Amino acid sequence: FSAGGCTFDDGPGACDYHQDLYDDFEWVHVSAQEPHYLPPEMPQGSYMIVDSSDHDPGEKARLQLPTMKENDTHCIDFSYLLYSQKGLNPGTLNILVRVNKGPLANPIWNVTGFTGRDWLRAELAVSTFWPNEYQVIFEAEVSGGRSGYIAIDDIQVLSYPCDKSPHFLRLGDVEVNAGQNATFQCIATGNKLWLQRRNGEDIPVAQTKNINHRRFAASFRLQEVTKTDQDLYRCVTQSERGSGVSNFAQLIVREPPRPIAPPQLLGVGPTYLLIQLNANSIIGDGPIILKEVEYRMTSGSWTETHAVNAPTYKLWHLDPDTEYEIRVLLTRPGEGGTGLPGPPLITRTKGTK
Amino acid sequence: SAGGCTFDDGPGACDYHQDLYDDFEWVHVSAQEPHYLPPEMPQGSYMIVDSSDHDPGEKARLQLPTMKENDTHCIDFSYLLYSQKGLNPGTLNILVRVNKGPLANPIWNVTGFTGRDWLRAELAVSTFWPNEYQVIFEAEVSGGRSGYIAIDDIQVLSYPCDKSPHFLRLGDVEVNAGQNATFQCIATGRNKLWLQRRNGEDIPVAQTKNINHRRFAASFRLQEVTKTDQDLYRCVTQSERGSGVSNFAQLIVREPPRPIAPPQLLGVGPTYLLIQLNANSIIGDGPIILKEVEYRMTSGSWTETHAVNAPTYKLWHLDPDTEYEIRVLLTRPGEGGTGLPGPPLITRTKGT
Ligand SMILES: *[C@@H]1O[C@H](CO)[C@@H](O[C@@H]2O[C@H](CO)[C@@H](O[C@@H]3O[C@H](CO)[C@@H](O)[C@H](O[C@H]4O[C@H](CO)[C@@H](O)[C@H](O)[C@@H]4O)[C@@H]3O)[C@H](O)[C@H]2NC(C)=O)[C@H](O)[C@H]1NC(C)=O
Ligand SMILES: *[C@@H]1O[C@H](CO)[C@@H](O[C@@H]2O[C@H](CO)[C@@H](O[C@@H]3O[C@H](CO)[C@@H](O)[C@H](O)[C@@H]3O)[C@H](O)[C@H]2NC(C)=O)[C@H](O)[C@H]1NC(C)=O
Ligand SMILES: *[C@@H]1O[C@H](CO[C@@H]2O[C@@H](C)[C@@H](O)[C@@H](O)[C@@H]2O)[C@@H](O[C@@H]2O[C@H](CO)[C@@H](O)[C@H](O)[C@H]2NC(C)=O)[C@H](O)[C@H]1NC(C)=O
Ligand SMILES: *[C@@H]1O[C@H](CO)[C@@H](O[C@@H]2O[C@H](CO)[C@@H](O)[C@H](O)[C@H]2NC(C)=O)[C@H](O)[C@H]1NC(C)=O
Ligand SMILES: *[C@@H]1O[C@H](CO)[C@@H](O)[C@H](O)[C@H]1NC(C)=O
Ligand SMILES: *[C@@H]1O[C@H](CO)[C@@H](O)[C@H](O)[C@H]1NC(C)=O
Ligand code: NA
Ligand code: NA
Incomplete structure (x- = not known):
């Protein structure tokens, strides 16, 4: 033996x-x-x-x-x-x-x-x-x-028989965007049962299922998770005959992205705006899977939103001597992965002269 | 000019x-x-x-x-x-x-x-x-x-140009295959209106609404889009007074990824399986934003799915002399971006 x-x-x-x-x-x-x-x-x-x-x-x-x-x-x-x-x-x-x-x-x-x-x-x-x-x-x-x-x-x-305690299968890592609900699911072969945080409070059972004659399942729900909840978690079960302990799976919490800098105006005419998005420098986590520009007239009742995959974008058939607000939205994977609108560029088209 | x-x-x-x-x-x-x-x-x-x-x-x-x-x-x-x-x-x-x-x-x-x-x-x-x-x-x-x-x-x-409508910029559209796509056009003016495919059939209006006193909007739906539909599209409106024509916006159709080959067995014991995913070779389109391993007992009462970001993965405390099916799932951005499960590895643990 070992x-x-x-x-x-x-x-x-x-x-x-x-x-x-x-x-x-x-x-x-x-x-x-x-x-x-x-x-x-x-x-x-x-x-x-x-x-x-x-x-x-x-x-x-x-x-x-x-x-x-x-x-x-x-x-x-x-x-x-x-x-x-x-x-x-x-x-x-x-x-x-x-x-x-x-x-x-x-x-x-x-x-x-x-x-x-x-x-x-x-x-x-x-x-x-x-x-x-x-x-x-x-x-x-x-x-x-x-x-x-x-x-x-x-x-x-x-190495054998090792049959006095329950055995946990591999516990998978979890990744969510901030504010989303996370769940750890533990499967064990084989009384008291809980999810243990590496340095923190122990989490009580949310749900339990008996999925087979030899195997059962238990679920631990973490609601509206926050970047401080990022830690290792493992399942533990205890009886008077002994205990079973799983692997420390990791909870990763991601922040939806938004840009640091506002857009800039590269060129302008009476009816067009040529804009640099400046979205390369961000707060939050990649990967960026979707970059959107929303633009509005300052008097406007409505806003127009376009998916853009370039450093620069051009808007046309604009009204002369009209002031526009332009923002960039960034998106990362998963529910809640769409961030908050970036800081605006407010500029206007030239006039009819 | x-x-x-x-x-x-x-x-x-x-x-x-x-x-x-x-x-x-x-x-x-x-x-x-x-x-x-x-x-x-x-x-x-x-x-x-x-x-x-x-x-x-x-x-x-x-x-x-x-x-x-x-x-x-x-x-x-x-x-x-x-x-x-x-x-x-x-x-x-x-x-x-x-x-x-x-x-x-x-x-x-x-x-x-x-x-x-x-x-x-x-x-x-x-x-x-x-x-x-x-x-x-x-x-x-x-x-x-x-x-x-x-x-x-x-x-x-350059002026006045007020006899025909003017379309604002039509944005490019990207969806995964089998998902429905929509083009939305915004026009100034008060008529015959359609979405024109550059090398293909012309698509009729789905819906039209009033967003402003000077500007109106029209929407076009393409159902269960396929890679054959990937083309440039532009809005056209026509009256006896003239026509307005938008920019050629692009429809992009992406293929949800899945692996070409099934996983392979690197090692096995009575209660564990060590698996090579072989997921680097795909038929769909990147980027891969989520790589998952699913494994099940062949009695299939339950299925276990894990997010894995490594070439190799290990499963443990399996039952001896029981057969497991293991597949790899790949996901790309957007609705429908989860591909079909990869080819299965079907193997069993040792017996001791
Ligand atoms: C026998 O083993 C069990 C299982 O481990 C054990 O029960 C655990 O006891 C610890 C205390 O030693 C519990 O942890 C505390 O729980 C209370 C709520 O009941 C919290 O208020 C505590 O918070 C402290 O730690 C935080 C760390 O982030 C601090 O921020 C905070 O300010 C406090 O300092 C702490 O989390 C744990 O919840 C239980 N778990 C279970 C499943 O019962 C039991 O104590 C052991 N018996 C003996 C005699 O040792
Ligand atoms: C005047 O202009 C309009 C708009 O371009 C023309 O209508 C278009 O005509 C083409 C054929 O030349 C149509 O394409 C065909 O569509 C049918 C199905 O509808 C398909 O079976 C054919 O293989 C071909 O793809 C197109 O749909 C149609 N568009 C609209 C909005 O009506 C019209 O023909 C022109 N008239 C003349 C006299 O040139
Ligand atoms: C646990 O396994 C690691 C990895 O080694 C693999 O698994 C072994 C069971 C055997 O099949 C190897 O051929 C595999 O490569 C062991 O790490 C290796 O240990 C050997 C011997 O000490 C050493 O020469 C290697 O450099 C180590 N690293 C690698 C990547 O192979 C480890 O020692 C094993 N531990 C126990 C307690 O068994
Ligand atoms: C439309 O605007 C662009 C941006 O200014 C023009 O591109 C430049 O045109 C000048 C000539 O007027 C060239 O010297 C530059 O090399 C061009 N490129 C850039 C990046 O400045 C374009 O010519 C304009 N065209 C019209 C018809 O207005
Ligand atoms: C988390 O679950 C609770 C259950 O009531 C729900 O109200 C809440 O909206 C959920 N939050 C997210 C981000 O899913
Ligand atoms: C696409 O639209 C049709 C209606 O034309 C609808 O029946 C179908 O469910 C839609 N598919 C998706 C993926 O939205
Ligand atoms: Na002794
Ligand atoms: Na003449």
Whole structure:
């Protein structure tokens, strides 16, 4: 099987597991060939432990697994327990999946409260693959008050069967123009289900379908999206048997284009205007799929709009000594891709003299 | 401006020429020769066609010099069709040839006996520099082989030019194939009105409305346009007082893109497929604004479609020993710009 698991018989370092000294406190290695100081109900062997007695409420210890950069589907099994001699809640065991050494995001699997003196088994299935990479982090958040122990053991990276957790298919990237509604659709083989933003709030389910005996679907709707919503999003589902985690798909938000500069007059007669559009410099996003000129008489009740694919445009059979307003509209792909009218050129034709 | 003619010194002095592939020539009448024509015919110097000397349908063409002007202008001319016995001498056609290209159908014609007096008409052509046009006076002989067609007093005027309507600029139109297209013309003035195809049939009006006290609008619909319809179109309006003619606007028909070849399999496992899209080769028209991969289980209860902007794509957590169909969709701008799905790759995952 792939590397990255650990039994802790030789300690965490032999498994390339590391702890940052700037976290509140360290996970402690429990080992055979060491004096048994723990309560006798606690399991024998070698594993990792956190003791709430030595610490204040909310202090966190984090054990960081080596980076995983695999091509084939795989899963991670681990054992955990939360124990107190008098049944207290020792805290929460959080599991974080950090992608591409970036933001940690919120936990994708957690258990809180007393479980017992026996090991419980859980499975992680993360749809993160080469060339992308991820770290699993085991986070213990302590309740305080000498409330017992949080412990983990027997980490294994497996290629089969990997059937204790649901599996997400590939989540596609989404691109929309600003102000348009966006939707992420997740498909999973195989209780709680949500869409996780890389650095932001978690989005609740809008819709769910059971599309097959083996496969179901869930939809997440983001309304009137804004350039600040541009981030990576991934689906997460959790059960007591384990969690499934999808790939971080990207939301791209595009701004409909409009020109920076107004049109300019290149030439004019009594009945014609020759105009330079100046539409090459814009605010917003390309590609420009349609460039339109609208022109109006300043007294006019109506406006004439033409598609133009040239730097210059010419208008004719105009009235002499008449003042016109000319604007350019720019269009990019998709709904809402037509921008706001550009800044106007206001000029007039020559007179009858 | 120059380009008119009184015909006092003849057609050659005005740079008026006749087409060598014409059936016969216009004849110059001069005051300098004895008036051999019927005395009812007007005196002076002008151009004439005698239907008696010719067979039915023989055509004579007198071609004016090229006009490449800026600013509104118009062409006035005098005409008559005369017979001693009131017979129909034929048809006087006026053709406006743009950019030395195809002549297209007449934009003004009169047929039948008019009388012995000159009648006056005006042309307004919205073709301007850098584009150019020729006016052609065409005489088609009636086949009753009797009477005369005559023209006189050609004048190019910049003002007032108020006997014929003037079209504003007609914009080019671009649509994807199978979509409906519309040309809209705006004209000044108060009649017969149509959209003229340069090398093709003339299209009748779909709708007409009043947008202003001085200007009116007309709309022409072409349904389910096809690459055969890609041509230049111009608006023409005609009255007994004259004609107005717009610029030759272009209809562009685009083909929605689709790939030539199906996707190919680069790699496969029990639960994944790695696919090469092969979408760089297409039959439609660019630009490609959206490239999509769709994949489905052959049981086809559901279909998954992803936007992909890379030569290769990977699908994962598929079921082992199950068959998948994968297609690539390409999209270009505008309504109907989504092409038909590409050729499918049909393959299955391994079994382990
Ligand atoms: C066990 O795991 C679950 C799943 O991760 C976890 O639930 C999540 O908890 C976090 C908090 O740790 C939630 O995130 C917050 O949600 C509230 C609304 O309920 C927001 O007000 C918060 O906003 C903060 O962050 C913003 C970042 O942009 C700031 O702008 C803002 O000002 C706030 O600082 C924050 O988004 C998250 O929504 C839930 N998700 C779910 C699905 O429940 C749970 O907490 C874990 N349990 C333990 C004990 O750790
Ligand atoms: C006077 O001018 C008008 C306008 O140009 C002429 O009408 C046009 O005549 C042509 C034929 O010369 C028509 O084209 C034909 O259309 C039919 C279908 O209608 C098609 O079957 C033929 O193959 C050909 O394409 C054209 O449609 C028609 N346009 C209009 C608006 O009527 C008219 O013929 C001229 N009269 C004379 C005596 O020259
Ligand atoms: C994951 O795959 C990448 C890409 O390699 C391709 O997939 C492999 C399964 C195999 O079929 C290769 O022939 C393919 O080209 C691996 O990246 C390559 O790794 C090899 C060996 O270390 C190296 O020589 C190449 O330079 C790497 N890059 C490329 C573009 O081939 C990667 O190592 C694989 N990782 C795991 C954990 O399997
Ligand atoms: C119509 O206007 C254009 C723009 O001025 C004219 O084009 C120029 O004409 C002059 C001669 O008058 C040349 O020296 C220039 O080389 C032409 N090009 C440009 C870009 O200036 C055109 O001649 C005008 N024609 C009429 C009949 O008015
Ligand atoms: C988004 O969806 C809501 C649903 O009520 C709708 O009112 C709104 O107009 C939608 N906006 C866009 C841009 O589609
Ligand atoms: C085109 O117009 C016809 C009516 O002439 C209509 O039936 C058809 O649906 C239209 N097609 C499109 C694509 O608008
Ligand atoms: Na162990
Ligand atoms: Na004369």
